[PDB]
Amino acid sequence: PLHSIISSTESVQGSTSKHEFQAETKKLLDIVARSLYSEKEVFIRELISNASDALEKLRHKLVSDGQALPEMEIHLQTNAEKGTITIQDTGIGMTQEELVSNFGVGFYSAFMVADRVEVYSRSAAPGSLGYQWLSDGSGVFEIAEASGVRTGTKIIIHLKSDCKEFSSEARVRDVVTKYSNFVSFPLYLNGRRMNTLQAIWMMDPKDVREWQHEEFYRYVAQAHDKPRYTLHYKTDAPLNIRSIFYVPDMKPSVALYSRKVLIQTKATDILPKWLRFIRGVVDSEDIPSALIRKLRDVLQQRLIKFFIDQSKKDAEKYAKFFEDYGLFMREGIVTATEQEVKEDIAKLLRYESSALPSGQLTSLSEYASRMRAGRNIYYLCAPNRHLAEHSPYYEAMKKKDTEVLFCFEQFDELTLLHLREFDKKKLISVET
Template structure:
């Protein structure tokens, strides 16, 4: 009996019986106009197919991995049990407990799948096993929508996945409601046909015995291999699954339950099963945060997502660049264990399950790419994770601060890599920093900073430094502190890149303190009409011109003096301090080369004793004064984080000290 094709699938796969060459053309002539009209009438033909070739396509090319045949046969068995449940609701009687049994025999090289489900009669065997792409489950769903929530099948090709690994397949079955003498045996021996024979004494349900091919396929006759595949794909199928008499799926699919029905212990056990399935049990032991939610619009979605308790470092972060702990299920059956398409890469640390009936799948039950439904799912899941973490930050700041120490690098990555400004700011809400208005070690968020802003303030000020002491002793902070403005302290070099990528938050521009200090210095320089005895105008010009000539045009694009009291003799500002430091860190430019591009502006504090001494010294000891000017300038670069190699300073300092010591205590630098 030849295998038949369902019309819809046949139209896709059948090939035309004849091939017409496009390179040869001829125009027949007709003496009778009526015959010519009849000859031009279109003729309809159905596609034909070589059934053997079609079977090869199904068996060898439809699925990515041979192991999925276990998933497909378990899914079929689960659907059969669901149909049995529906039959029992109508008063029909089935035999035995509702379960799926798998038996392996390594010596015989066989694996057997049995279920106590609805079973099949002769018409069912011909229709569903003899017709490729005819789905009995899909028919059942269409006819019983209110009672088919747990039915999995869609395409009618899952059974043929067994042909990838089988030399032969024998199906024995009896349908619920039929007599004991109405059993049937369906046999396929690897060729282009199958046989159906009557047999009696069978229980209701279906038994599929597969004799496996020699080679890799034979491994599926091993119990451990079957358990491994079940744990990966079908562990949460609602029906009990027994392998060689022992049940292997003991946990409920808790994502299908209401959140109030699931306690902490259930979540921890479920989490352990997930990380075991993903091979991450050594990395994660328990969940820190749990996100359990369900939605029906705009798409149907059931999900449980965990944020594991763990300690990440730079090495771990880099090692997990392509890892994703989110698994996609459809009706409790695993579709993809590493569903990277459902979340942005910077949230790859989550562990969890997403189950959606609306997810678009292709024929081999694999996820379609670039689909509108996927984009909706991604947005829902991303918004839920970010929103939940924002709530946790407010609910328990201490716990969140500990969590942030380990996971901050992911959120920083998110701000930098996200293209959408709104999402950037949602991620940025999770960032924490020290602040000039808080004690050392106490962290605050950008959102809380905005709430504390002065009424007329329109910018968020931040400053990078290696630690708080350096930040608070900086000449830039010295300027802004005098105006009582709050400053966020960034200690991680990545934070500066994050702020450059973020640009603004809550419609407030993110402004580095160095930029603000430069603008203030320029403003005060223009407004500075202070009558001072430090320098007359000609002396001021003389000093500044000398410093600019001594240091050179690369180091000094512009120079100005001010009379603002400060502990620092010189302050250097550039066009973009953050970008300059970033280029230095990444090694994209050589040391000091960046000064050409960023045009340093040197602000000289004319009230500082060292500046006054240098002015006098240049007349009596030009060499020492020049060395001192270079040292003062490099000190300013160190304060700004704009110098990478400080080794040359050692020789200069030794020479400077030698010159000063040679003056036997009479140096003007010591007696301004």
């Protein structure tokens, strides 16, 4: 059964007071209309966003007053013959003052694809009047008092003669499923429900449980396994961040959202290249490939700290993790620039030692703890534990009461060599 809300109930009795766009608003209007977004199809996205916030404020208000909740829904409709696309929401509306004046600039994106825009809106405030708002992208909009306007906002877009594609149910479905699959209010396209997914990264980390994480993981990783690691990172402090990061059970990307709406699917430069094995999502208000940097840096710091924490609370699990993904960590160490970056990532490294039984691992930072003040870090990055336990260059350190690290692969040694020093303090093989 079809669930539609959109019908033409509106009528304007009197006439329209014409209104000129102010200098500043007309400018930015034009720049949104032809110089702000790259893709045409994000007008649907931004409009849905505005509908979402309208519904959210209606809800917040009604629940605050303790009054019942009505249908809080976003409805989209396409009309091929009349060449339109309509988006209606039962949210909070706009007063006359707001319509005349006017998060929420996104609305003007409508003019990238439209030759005429027709909007009906009635505020949720008691005893409110509905209003019509007309514009053609010029400096002039008409305004009128209308009737047959349901509470909430109705936006009818008349499409440019070449922008007609967004009057097809298919294309619009694809755009909606691509950008707004996590919108927090029910969304209908020509009567059919669309969004079914829950932006669990906005939830409170304690309120999410493994089945949800596995679901979302198999969504954003396009995978069929489970995450061996899950970080749920929220911060308002230096920058607004709502992110979830997964490390697959499998052995060998991150999506960029903002305000629960998609911006970048294969959001590449959000993380260091050595963390490109991580799966998941990052949501931040602060996103419009020029400066996404201070984001990448604190995501790197946080993630590194996470893998360290995980090191301390489970060691064999982190051991297997180091076996399966230590490649990326070595690579990232060699690829870095500043020493303390290299050492930050180096804090994720695990190798055998003289003092530990065969298989037991430590990091550079750790058993530099029996290490008496000076001094230096020595290693021997051999082919075998046996062959290194009874290697001449090593017993040169056996009873000179000193600790020696054991590598068994060349890439470990090359990495250690490039590292040169860790914590002001140098690394050199016992073969020199």
